Nucleic acid binder design. Sequence first.
RNA 1: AAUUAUUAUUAUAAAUAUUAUUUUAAAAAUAUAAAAAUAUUGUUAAUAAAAUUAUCAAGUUUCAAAAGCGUUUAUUAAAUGCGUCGGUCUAAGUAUUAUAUUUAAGAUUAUUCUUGUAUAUAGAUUUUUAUUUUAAUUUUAUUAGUAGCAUAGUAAUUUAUUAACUGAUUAUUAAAGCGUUCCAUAGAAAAUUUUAAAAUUAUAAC
Lengths: 133, 66, 157, 176, 167, 85, 37, 54, 309, 39
Amino acid sequence: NPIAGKIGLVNRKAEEWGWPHQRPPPTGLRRSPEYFPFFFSRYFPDVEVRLVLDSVLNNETTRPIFHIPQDMSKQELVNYLKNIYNIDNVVRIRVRNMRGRRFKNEVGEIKSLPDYKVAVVELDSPVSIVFKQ
Amino acid sequence: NRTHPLSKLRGNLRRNPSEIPRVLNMMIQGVWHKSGNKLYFRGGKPPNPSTHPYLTGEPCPVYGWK
Amino acid sequence: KSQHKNVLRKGRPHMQKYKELNRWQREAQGITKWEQGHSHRPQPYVERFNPEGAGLTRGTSAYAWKWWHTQYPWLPNVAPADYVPPSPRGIRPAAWDDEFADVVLSMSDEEIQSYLLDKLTEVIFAETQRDGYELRRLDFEGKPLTELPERRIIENF
Amino acid sequence: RKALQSYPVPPRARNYERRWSSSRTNPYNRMFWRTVLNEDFARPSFWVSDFRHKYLAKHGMDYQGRVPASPAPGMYQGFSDVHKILANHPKPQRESRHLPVMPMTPRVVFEHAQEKRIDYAKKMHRDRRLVEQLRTHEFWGWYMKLQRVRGRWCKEHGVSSRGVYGPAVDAAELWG
Amino acid sequence: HGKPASGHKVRTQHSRRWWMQSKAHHLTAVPHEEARSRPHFPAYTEDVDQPMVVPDGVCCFNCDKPIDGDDINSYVWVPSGNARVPTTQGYFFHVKCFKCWNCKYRIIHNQFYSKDSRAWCLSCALGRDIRVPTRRWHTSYVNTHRTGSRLTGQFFPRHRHQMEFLF
Amino acid sequence: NACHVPGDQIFLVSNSFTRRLLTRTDHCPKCDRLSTFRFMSVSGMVGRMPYKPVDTPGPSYATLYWRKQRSGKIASQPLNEVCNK
Amino acid sequence: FKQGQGMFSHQLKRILNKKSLHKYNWDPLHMYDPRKL
Amino acid sequence: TYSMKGQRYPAEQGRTSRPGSLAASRDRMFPLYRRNYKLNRELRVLDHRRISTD
Amino acid sequence: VRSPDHGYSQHILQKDIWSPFQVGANMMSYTPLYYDWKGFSSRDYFGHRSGTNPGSKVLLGHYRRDEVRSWGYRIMVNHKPQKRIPKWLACVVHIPRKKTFLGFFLYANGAYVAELLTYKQLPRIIYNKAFQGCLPTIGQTVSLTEVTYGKEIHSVEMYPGHGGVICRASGTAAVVLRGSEPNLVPLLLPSKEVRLFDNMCHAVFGRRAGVMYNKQRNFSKRSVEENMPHRPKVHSKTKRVSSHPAGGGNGGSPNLLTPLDWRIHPRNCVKTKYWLSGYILRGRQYNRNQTVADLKSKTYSWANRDPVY
Amino acid sequence: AATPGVGIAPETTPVKYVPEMLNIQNAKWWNGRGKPVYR
RNA sequence: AAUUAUUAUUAUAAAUAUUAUUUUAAAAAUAUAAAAAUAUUGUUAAUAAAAUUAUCAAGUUUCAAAAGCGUUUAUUAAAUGCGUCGGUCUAAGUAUUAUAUUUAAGAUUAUUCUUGUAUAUAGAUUUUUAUUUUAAUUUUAUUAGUAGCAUAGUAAUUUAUUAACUGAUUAUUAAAGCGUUCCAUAGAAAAUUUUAAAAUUAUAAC
Ligand SMILES: [Zn+2]
Ligand SMILES: [Zn+2]
Ligand SMILES: [Zn+2]
């Protein structure tokens, strides 16, 4: 829904700064990378790059598949694996966008999970996982 | 092209009441370019302009993006 | 006609047009349907224009594909919108020099426009006209009644 | 009904009207004879038919020669959708001397998208018969193995394959 | 005075003045009034008199590169009735060499003008100058391997051919 | 009633092989290989039409002139036989 | 033969009831700029 | 195979994870019907490369 | 050349005016002279195809359509020739829809732009130069002072220096009338109404052009009537009596007494002169019945203008 | 396409026919969109 | 299009895939017709523009009435359309022009006379007819006339048919056609003559 709702702004303030009680931070600070949600981001990112194992299991793969939040572009997924998981060999990333899984819970409401973003990275030297039974 | 607050770059994801009539016609209609290929929306799952990664830069002819 | 085959429809279907969106923009704004306050007229298109049309007043060739077919001839000349007024600054041409500047600057900008018109009527009807054509009406015998051309012939020259 | 200005190229078949006229196909071969036969029919396409009015003025003559096609670089620079104030030619160029390049209008790119999907179609057909001329080509080559192995077997087992009778009904070369 | 004197043009394809204006004047003998009428041409021109095969010394008129013998429909074989001069049979063109040589676009409505052994577009070859079409520029709409040219030319009785009823 | 890359043949087609009618695959004897044939013209029917004589459709004025060349003027060779054995 | 009975015509009749943001943008004093006084 | 408008049967589409059967995707039951979008693009679509002019 | 204008007559009725000398279409569309613009059809403010409100002179004739074709030949016209700089008629172009002839003049200081082409003009000749006389040469653009009584002039300008407005149509001519006024010259406009033109006004000497338009131009072909495309002009007496008072009647009703388009156009009633200029001397009504010649006899002064209208 | 229903008055007298001229009832609770402006 | 329905959604391109949804032992009607001697309109309001065909799917002719070829919700002397003509317009468009109409092109001609609207008008009404509008009741001259012509009628004569409520011809006072009349007239709707496959009567004939 593109249409902006009134409440959604108000609910944004009350957590950004205690809205009815604490006066706002001056508009200069809000336009700055030192504003807390821009500071809680530049230093404490919040991302869920979950790895699918069904493609990286006992079968060797050069193309392990991930899921990354819808708003992680390609060159960020590089930066991510590079600086957080030491992965240094990514020549091409291949990115879809998938409607989050949907289903009917036993009650009956259609409980649709959040949506994600398949990003089939392509490492140089293939990777694998062992599973001893 | 959604854009980051700090980024001086300007994107056309407006939500003013005067601009949502065209921002839906991008998400549900999509664009049929006069070259024959359907643009931004061509298939089933309509994009979510507000969950796009931010506009990083204008395109160039020689490379892709400055 | 008793047979409506109704197969001549169905070909090249129209766009969906989602008229709920304009129905919404009305309410998501103070205005009603734009009651005949405008009601409309067909706006022009960029194709039917002809830039470089030797009309257009030469300032507007993109502002003027709109505005009508019956108005853009009159669209006034204004400025490049960056041209600043003629400014009485002190930059004199590189080699015009003083003596000439001291004399010319004495003449004001009606004392110089007047001199220029006389000289130009003198430059035309001079080497330019006496060289081939004639620019002053002649009498019974064919003698040039007036000395120099009449002020209109010069204007449109 | 899907205004023609939307189609990349205006549509090939153009349906009209005429309650009392029922035929899908536009009558070409009549729109062709006029136009080829009559020079005037199609607007001069300014440039190739300008360049007079600019030779006559500067040379005092009729040009009296074939006018160059491909409008000179620098002509029709303010125009945007020329396509009529020209033939369907491209907007000529800048006023430069760089090698001619098609200004990739949305139209030119579409034509590229045809001459690749023409080569695509003629290629999916060209090699159906190339494999069809293996299947049937090799089915026959194999079928003759069958009539050979049947040919060999039908001699030792003596099944003449010519009825209940002996060859003495054949040798007459009657029906019997 | 039957009244509705303005009418529908109800006859017309039910006349004998029509039956003579519907015929085709093709390259056959078929004296007249015996050629086909509605489609204007008979299907399956039988040509047992002369086999009508593609030759071996065959080459593109416009391009001159040798043409695949017969295994393909990449060539537009225009047998202009009995031609002989362009080749043993009629002009030959690969589908992509079928453009106007002088203006280099397609041959609109496929009527070309053989200018000194290089097919020229009729309009350019005629002196006219409108030099770009709308639909497809550098490739004609033509059919391949005579399949578009078999609407005309040399139906079965191409001559007297009275060997039939004579003894 | 069927030709070739360069030659001809003749055959009456049934209902069962109506698919292979337009263009066949066959051993072209003016060659030694199977080569695709075409359908230069009709030469009759494979059976009777109801209430009609033996030659209901009739071969053609055309396929007859093909026959009158094959059998036709054999006067080059009534020698070596005429119809006998 | 209408068109578009599908879901996009089933949302665009339900999500557009969402009341857009309102801000009383009061009239701009163009000709009488107040801060240049 | 190619990115063409087409009509699929619904069982062919494969069902959600049912109580009786796992999620049977349209691929793992019909492998040779997975579209090959390399083979599409290589053949059917116009590459930026072929018209890059500047 | 025989008769620089011909009634070419392709079909025995279809008579279009070909002129030998007419430039071929190729040498017609000139770039910086070609204007294009949708013409509004008859739609005026709020679409609403409609004429003009009774009192106004801005025409949106109800029955108008396809005024600017879009790939029809449309070059703009000068209407302001310059006084005595020689011309040079380069070609003579003939546009059917704007029935006017118009030929391209070089005008001797490079200006390949001038159009209105006076009758008996030949191409590739110099025109604006005077002979021994004052300026009595066909094509010479003459101030109204330089003309004498009784000789035709065309493209007369109504207000001096404001471009030629009167007598632009083919074969037309404003005849001088030898008035008595101090600094004004009365011209017998073709509408048989005389007008005190300022003598300093500029007119082009001669007839106008393309004689044999007055008649002898008759299309009578469905394709060829696209020189003048206009909307259908329905009967006013088959118009759904709810709509138009003349209507119905079970047969051919002749029509109502007082004819009316939608408001009124009774046959000679609606005369719609509302403002007469200070120059006007006798409107077309004051002369409609006399003759062409008797109006050429008198001398015209301010006392001839009738104090009441 | 639209209609004011009032009919454009002369450019000099911009308002003829207020809806009150007809004894109209336009309570906000009666027909909804009612309440006039000249008020 | 209420559907997994009549249903190639024709923007394109291409041309040999052994691509793959249709119950079943009967005669009535009926949808329907392969086949087949005579007869050729006697059927009927009226035969003839009436599916496909390898037996290759086409009636010819005369007369009378009838314009343009476009265009229409009960589909045409409907309404368009060119020309001529009437009126209007020289401070928004070129008075051999564009508005606003009436007609209809082509070819002959376009008659007699005015009580009202309009114009002009003079404080207004009331008065008032250069042109225009509408009118002519004995306008009725030209012209065609039993005609889409208020009844009278199947008009009276002539043909034509074995039989002429047909149709055409002559003239001719037509209940009150009439100069925008009349002629000329092509595919239409009639009337003949004539030929002819639809299973037209006879006639029933899977
Ligand atoms: Zn070739
Ligand atoms: Zn060419
Ligand atoms: Zn062979």
